Subunit: 493 residues, 4 copies
């Protein structure tokens, strides 16, 4: 675990359009905070509708037929992405430090997980660029028919604050590999890593207007994306509420394509035959990773009665071992929550747990004199009508529940409007296969949890989202299929 | 061209849920008319929110894990579809007559085109059922990862009145092949063929609740589909306005998946080197097929100056050869428009053409003492700001325009919020390829027009829709991808 | 289990070329026998080099550019195949009776398994015909590149006597769906079902010369196929020895494409945690199905020491329950071996088992006064250097072996030049996955055996064959890929 | 065009097995010559059967289950390949100089074409490694079925002398991306670039035994590959004669998988409407590139009568513009032929042209006092029974022929046992499509020639080879498909 051996200096704080830095049209700036100290870190230009319009015009122009982005070899798009990945690898110390400081993310995770996942995903995406293929099709009649899998066009991409760099790369990686141009709006909480990457996009050699980054607020810069008449597609990760607003604004404006990833209330089912220690460890890391601020948080754990008390006890001993503090100090193993809204929401939900009658096993309150810290918290004997069983908490708050009937527990796992992920822990082949098939979730892990790789499509069932990101599948949402059918005198198979 | 040698008797007029006929919960019925006579043909049960709720519960139940539709072999879903196609082939005379009478569709087309396309598309779809495959994926780490391409669930499908039977099959064919259950709402104008097919679904042996058909109105039965909390996906073909309402209602309710096909203002570009007679014929059939009531109507024809006057003259001579009347009488080559709304809209747009200064070459008014007939109408010297150049007419109304610059005419072809289809007529390889690539349209025909086959994906760019129907691609919109990732002790390539 | 209620009358006994019946050029005929009685059933025209040349010229002509087979819609090839499947379904009683009588195959299996598999496989293949697609490829430079997946051309197909009808359909199904023409040489032992199917090919409406069937001998009619200068591809199922001759003759002549399926010595590994009864049943049916005359015969069964004696005992009790006799009489559960060569080979191998020191548990000799019957035979304490552990017996002869080390038993399972299939019986997820990955075999069954479906590719590792048949994969071996690359003025993604 | 500014020093001259340098078991060495001077350049260790056995054992061991090559992430195989490409890019000057000196290849081509194609192809292949996916398959019955696309195993790869570096990378790139281990035998004429790349394989970090390189002779080291009992697959580019020997030896030994690329006699058809200058240029470069020593050499040019004399005249003026000499000196535009065998064969064929009555337009003899130089030579009025129209010359020798009937000229183009490539030059869409479909060739170029990219599959019809290399398709020949079918209690779609 190497570290930056010189204090981090923030440099890129402006709006990035056509590979140059622009001040906000209004001249307004907004503050950016560190969540562990509540101290301001810098001011960033505040983008709004007028700046979005500028980014969109640049993106549109970069996408015109005959332009350098449209006419370069697909293999050269791939090369640009590969080069960006090498540049990110060059600035890894810096970016991981910036991510940790701005995002409240543990430095060891920022460096070993986030940054590594950024680099690997870009390289994965680089590899697809010249391997996106259409078809030739044996249509009835004397015709030659082929399809092109073209890029869609200008894609607006609204990113959240929990994984600012991973999510930036998950969005722009596929979009760019397929040949699209993008207008990115980072989360207001966490604009900084995105703007450093924009400096690397320029340095890699991407043509101007291919990537534009407009820091700003949601109901301002985000709503101007979602309602824009010349944006062909919008991709969004974040809250359900906003997902609904995005889909509505899309329908009202120009029927732009929409893909969403919206969090979850993901269940694990631990059968009596499970390797218990393995199940406790993965369920634990499933819910507590990054202060609970993961979409796939393992936030309902159903354990068969006969091993339930052992499961609860082992889980509590594990939750009691954290050291809270500044995510930059080695040995610190739990950072702060991102901000006051999230902090309030977590405390309120913990309170509802106590009031509705859940059994509190540890934690249950705030921590420290500054920073948005919450004690890791475990509730046992949770039941299905409680707020902590139904609502995404997005904090370090584990719910543990009992079951004795397998048909019953699968219905309880499925009885939610969410559907992002689930975990099954069993040694039996048949149950692993039949349970995983019956679960209404986009990713199901068997005997593990939270395993996410560039090679696999990732996305929700139900209100956890639509579409898929990554894997071969993800690239489909970033193309528009055109059929060309040509009259010929006579066809031959 | 064989005919039904016994008068058509209407038999199925009720709501179809769980393979039985139901009266409307309200007890209300609505009338159904013949467009060529304006006479009522029968009354049909009027479905509303309460009946949609019943159809959805049946569909949901038919989709439960462990049910006959979920556990039967994929090859047996395929077999059911094949059998349905054979039954439709058995009742071809009847269905074509019913289609013609209710839909105002020329009998020869109903029999030779629609019914044939219904049968072929079903058989195409039957073939995919056991050929829908997921993947195994060489994920980083010691895991086994696979995907399932599962059915999505309960699909609501809202069909229009222009191609009632083709569009029913385009919707249910893929949906069923992939393993979904469906709630279909036929157009209020044209419920009858759908309900006859429901009798054939029962006779083929589909399990109850797999297909449910709820005739009724749009803002009642359609809005209850689009806003329903237990419908996983909605597919819709029809007007832009309603498309926007559907997408909005989806976002407000349960973030159901949405696919739309929304018509167009599709352009042809006729270059000076084109086979002129071939271009005139295909552009003509492109705009006048089924009384102009096609989504892909070739409604802006740009012709290079040097052949423009010849193109116009030949086009007018062709338009002057129709015989209007009842679509059942042989020799009749133009039927009525579907109803009064559409009829009024077409007359109004024709009037705007005259007023805005287009040159009228033939037609321009109504015809007959009954039926919603419009004379085939040709406008030359149309220019791009006129209503007849911008708005989908959906009537027999051809627009012909001039160009001399190729870069310019491609911008004019693209300068529309629509993007369903386009045609290019040239003998030159390079232009065919480069023009077809630059056109912002879902299907581009070269030296032909209106060629649509089950083997090709079909759908819009821009506001002409999202998603694709048919071909291999179409089946993708009817699956939900699940990733299953299993921990293993050691992987080996 | 319905039966033919009228004595079977043999009708088609000639060479089938250009959809007509031809006598041998030489005028020679050969006899065909029933294996259960050793009585002659009829004489069949004997095809040789001169008749193969005639069939090849017909096939070549049917494949010319501009011919009806090359220019018909792919969907219509599919329709012909579907129709053939319906005709086979019509003549099911007859064909199953013919298969049983000529092939020594139990009537219940012939009817319920073979004929059903013939019908299902044809229908599967019918479905692929218009779903074979090439690609469009984003090549470097200003080019348009696409591929066609064309048929290869004239395919020679040499079929064995164990599954005459299944294997005929496995060969012609894919070949025809892809658009090839074929010259089929059925086994000399079993020409009759093939020639009845040829009558159905004519009746279905296949153009002449698309399918040609040349009954005859191996070193005559088969060698003329394998060495022919105008046959593009040869597919073969049968002995290793002949496989080597085919591959050699291909290399010496015209470098025709070659695919082989060559039998095996397929192992099962039964772990201590296995459901024992399930493992005994499937291993039993694995080796004894169709008198042991299956390529995938489970001919080495390794069982963990701690359950080995129980496994052996249960296996012997199951083997002792057969009734030998004429495969047409209900209640008969073991038929004869196909002929004297096979009969001698099985007796000789049984003798070597006794002499080399294997423990004989039941059977071990011939049965009856006529027919090529062998008693079902079980050997325990078999060890790896014995002939019965190394050589494919192709008779009802089960070998059961002991193991205690899992690494060791996987090496023993793999230590063979064969590699067709294998079985693993365990309840543990990890072992199922890691064992199946380590086994050098084309199909691995987990907790079952002998499960073969049209949807799965099927074929050998190592000397068990090359290429794959069926599934999506199988269709690849029946196409030839052509790349077409077109210069254009400017490409755009 | 940069150059090596220091004399080339040859360093790697030994056999490469398990990432170390080995002397021949026999202690024998063979000489390596420069073709432009006929001077010896160095001695190289001579590998034979005994050294092949050593390389095969190393490859086999590197492929064992549990080894580092089998257990590393697919993405890390990809990373190794990417790193190798960067190392080759680092040593580009050196390798291009070495290629030119040893291979008689023009330095500008070696640097700008060969080395660039090596680098691009490796990077293309790097991208596929973690994108090779199997399937999940909806088999009939209650089973879970998936396929693995595993590597095949030990692949022997025999490379020719015309494109030593390109062909090395075309072989090892896909093989390695898919996870195979390889034993490479470079051409005796040109072992040197291969052994330098082996030093880069070691430096990149490939595990030992993954790549082994055994320089030596064909009937010794090559025949030991083709007949080896533990080599799973052999890939070969070279002469037809040897292709037949390889396929035969494969069949006699262990039925190893075989893929061949075997040269051609590729035709161009120039229609009267063609851009004539474009056709002359591309046909010219088609036949004369690399001294005619290309498999895809455009060695029969059929030109429509009405433009034939103009075509011939322009072609001759172009052929007259070369400067022969040492391929290292700038301004030199034609190098020597590779060696005496090839030199003799070319002179002999030129002589047969003169004797059989072809019209000689220029060249026709040797050149210089040292080096294997041949004058660029043009023959017009060639007719189809002449040796120069039938036999692959593999020298700078252009044949130009007349036609007036299009059906006739397509038969003449197809009337050959070769089938590698062809060219069509026309401005007409229909002819481009219908001619390209009727030509029996693996790649057909339209309005260009010799366009080969990593993204496209490449290979022969007929005796020009079997299988395909590169593109998505190429990777298929380097996997072995395994089906795993698992019994389950109940399946659900
Ligand atoms: N894409 C196409 O092929 C079609 C395009 N159109 C276009 O739209 C214009 C208007 O025609 P209309 O018949 O009014 O089409 P419409 O779009 O309103 O009717 C089509 C279908 O949508 C249903 N519908 C209507 N209102 C709805 C609502 N609020 N929620 C859910 N479903 C609803 C109708 O009941 C019918 O089943 C036409 O002149 C034509 O330009 C119309 C029909 C088909
Ligand atoms: Cl908000
Ligand atoms: Cl907010
Ligand atoms: Cl808010
Ligand atoms: Cl409406
Ligand atoms: Cl309305
Ligand atoms: Cl309305
Ligand atoms: Cl033999
Ligand atoms: Cl024999
Ligand atoms: Cl023999
Ligand atoms: Cl040789
Ligand atoms: Cl030689
Ligand atoms: Cl030689
Ligand atoms: Yb918010
Ligand atoms: Yb505070
Ligand atoms: Yb409407
Ligand atoms: Yb009226
Ligand atoms: Yb034999
Ligand atoms: Yb006997
Ligand atoms: Yb040679
Ligand atoms: Yb000399």
């Amino acid at each position: 675990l190497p570290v930056l051996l010189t204090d981090l200096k923030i440099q890129y704080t402006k709006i990035f359009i056509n590979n140059e830095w622009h001040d906000s049209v209004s001249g307004k700036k907004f503050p950016v905070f560190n969540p562990a100290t509540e101290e301001e870190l810098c001011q960033v230009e505040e983008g709004d509708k007028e700046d979005v319009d500028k980014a969109v015009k640049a993106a549109r122009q970069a996408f015109q037929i005959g332009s350098p982005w449209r006419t370069m070899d697909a293999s050269e798009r791939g090369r640009l992405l590969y080069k960006l990945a090498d540049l990110i690898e060059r600035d890894r110390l810096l970016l991981a430090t910036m991510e940790s400081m701005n995002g409240g993310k543990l430095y060891s995770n920022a460096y070993l997980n986030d940054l590594a996942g950024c680099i690997k995903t870009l390289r994965y995406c680089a590899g697809w660029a010249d391997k996106i293929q259409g078809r030739t099709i044996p249509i009835d009649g004397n015709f030659f028919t082929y399809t092109r899998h073209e890029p869609i066009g200008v894609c607006g991409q609204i990113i959240p604050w929990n994984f600012p760099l991973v999510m930036l790369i998950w969005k722009i990686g596929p979009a760019l590999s397929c040949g699209n141009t993008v207008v990115v709006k980072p989360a207001e909480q966490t604009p900084l890593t995105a703007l450093h990457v924009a400096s690397l996009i320029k340095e890699a050699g991407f043509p101007p207007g291919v990537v534009n980054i407009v820091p700003g607020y949601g109901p301002t810069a985000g709503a101007a994306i979602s309602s824009h008449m010349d944006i062909d597609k919008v991709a969004f990760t974040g809250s359900t509420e906003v997902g609904k607003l995005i889909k509505e604004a899309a329908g009202k404006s120009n029927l732009k394509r929409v893909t969403l990833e919206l969090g979850g209330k993901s269940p694990c089912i631990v059968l009596a035959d499970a390797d218990l220690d393995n199940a406790v460890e993965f369920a634990h890391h499933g819910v507590f990773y990054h202060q609970g601020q993961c979409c796939i948080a393992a936030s309902r754990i159903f354990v068969e009665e006969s091993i339930y008390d052992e499961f609860v006890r082992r889980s509590v001993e594990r939750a009691k071992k954290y050291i809270l503090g500044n995510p930059l100090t080695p040995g610190v193993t739990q950072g702060p929550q991102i901000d006051k809204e999230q902090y309030d929401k977590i405390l309120d939900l913990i309170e509802s747990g106590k009031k509705e009658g859940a059994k509190l096993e540890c934690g249950g309150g705030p921590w420290g004199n500054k920073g948005y810290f919450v004690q890791p918290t475990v509730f046992s004997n949770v039941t299905d009508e409680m707020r902590i069983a139904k609502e995404e908490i997005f904090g370090p708050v584990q719910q543990i529940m009992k079951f004795k009937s397998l048909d019953d527990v699968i219905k309880r796992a499925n009885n939610t409007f969410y559907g992002l992920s689930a975990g099954v822990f069993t040694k039996d082949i048949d149950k692993a296969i039949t349970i995983s098939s019956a679960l209404q979730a986009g990713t199901v892990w068997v005997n593990c949890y939270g395993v996410v790789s560039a090679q696999c499509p990732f996305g929700g069932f139900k209100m956890s989202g639509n579409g898929r990101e990554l894997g071969e599948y993800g690239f489909h949402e970033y193309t528009e299929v055109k059929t060309v059918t040509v009259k010929i005198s006579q066809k031959n198979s």
